[PDB]
Structures are given as C-alpha cells and as structure tokens.
Write a protein that binds this ligand. Structure first.
Ligand SMILES: NC(=[NH2+])c1ccsc1
Ligand SMILES: [Ca+2]
Length: 223
C-alpha cells in the first residue's frame, strides 16, 4: 500500500496473508473454511495466515492453516487478468473471534464514489522498494468506469473496476494482490493489477467481486 497508514493490529480481521515460506499475497476470509484471493496468486503449498499484524513476529493471535484445495475461476485469463479470482479451502476451520472474522459478500455491486478500505502488506513506495511488517490501510473511492477505461484503454472488462486517486500518491502495490477492497461492509474488490503503483492517471484495478457471488456460493457449497 502506497500513501496509506498503519491500520492497527487486527483492525482488519478478515485480512489474511498467503504464505509459501514467505508472504506473497493477501486474501479475505469469507467463512470459517474459505478464503477469496486473486487467481494470479495461485500456487501449490499455500499456508493461510489469519489474525496477523506483524507478519514477521508471532504476536499471539495468529492461526496458521494449510490449504486443502484451491479453485481458480474457470474463465481466468492470465494474459489479461480477466476473472482474477480464486477460492482457497482451509484444511481445518478457522476459530472465529474478534481478530479473525469473515467479511460478507456483496448483495449487489457498489456505486462509483463509494469509499472503500484497501489493505495489505505490499510495497509502500511508488519508486523503489520497502515492505512493511505491519498491515497497511488505504481509504479510496471507486472510480467511474470511464475514468478506469481511459487510464487502461483496451484492458478493462466488466469484471474489473478502478479505485483510488487519479492524482496519484495513494494506491495498492505489489504484495497487496489478492487482498480486500471492502465498501460499506462488503467485499467488493480483490487487489488485482495496475501500472506501477500510485502513478498519476493509473489507478489500481480490482476484480469486481459482485459479479462472482453466485460462483463463490455454488463452488463452496459443492466443495
Ligand atoms: N498499482 C496497483 N494497484 C497494483 C496492484 C497490484 S500490483 C500494482
Ligand atoms: Ca504475526
């Protein structure tokens, strides 16, 4: 997260870290058995880390649970990042508490201008590299589809939306992928891609979760 702030320990209790020897992506807990992330975060051997604040220090509220299965969206296109969503099942159910909590799925899509909370452990610099140990947060509005498509001509599908600031300076970034965009208490986005980070006229691009609710519900009910 570039241009954000330190969230505070466990203030984003649905935020998970995906670990394969190291943190590599975020995700969102949607019930005690299932996490939503980005398809481009897929790999085998994922451990889900819940209740994290400092990802380099055991602080006492963590749960570390191996994935038993991953399901990449059937229409995921790795070239274009269309349908950049996957589901991860936990080998054992998480123990839900105030610091490890699920986030509700949308009952409809969110409007342009709605303010959202974006979070993760990704790079905090727009030029150069600095990774935080603690979770970072950014408040950012959903942008109009025209401003999104103008920024990324030929690259935006109806399964993507933009959020952030056209002036630059505030954005998600590498290492935040797969993590949440929460608006009005619902998981409306997944950190997906962008051009650099926090660059002018290049806002972040997010998977449009509201298009996937039926797929999510049916997939988790059958797996
Ligand atoms: N600029 C962004 N929002 C971004 C997200 C993942 S990699 C870059
Ligand atoms: Ca920790």
């Amino acid at each position: 997260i570039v241009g954000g702030y330190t969230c505070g320990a466990n203030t984003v209790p649905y935020q998970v870290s995906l670990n394969s020897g190291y943190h590599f992506c975020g995700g969102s807990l949607i019930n005690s058995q299932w996490v939503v992330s980005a398809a481009h975060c897929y790999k085998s051997g994922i451990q889900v880390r819940l209740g994290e604040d400092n990802i380099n220090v055991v602080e006492g509220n963590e749960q570390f649970i191996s994935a038993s299965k991953s399901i990449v969206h059937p229409s995921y296109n790795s070239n274009t990042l269309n349908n950049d969503i996957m589901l991860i099942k936990l080998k054992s159910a998480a123990s839900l508490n105030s610091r490890v909590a699920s986030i509700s799925l949308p009952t409809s899509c969110a409007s342009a201008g709605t303010q959202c909370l974006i979070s993760g452990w990704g790079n905090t610099k727009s030029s150069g590299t600095s990774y935080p140990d603690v979770l970072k947060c950014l408040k950012a509005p959903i942008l109009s589809d025209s401003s999104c498509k103008s920024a990324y001509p030929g690259q935006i599908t109806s399964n993507m939306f933009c959020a952030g600031y056209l002036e630059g300076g505030k954005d998600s970034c590498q290492g935040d992928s797969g993590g949440p965009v929460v608006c009005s208490g619902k998981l409306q986005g997944i950190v997906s891609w962008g051009s650099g980070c926090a660059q002018k006229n290049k806002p972040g691009v997010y998977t449009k979760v509201c298009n996937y609710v039926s797929w999510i519900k049916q997939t988790i009910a059958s797996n």
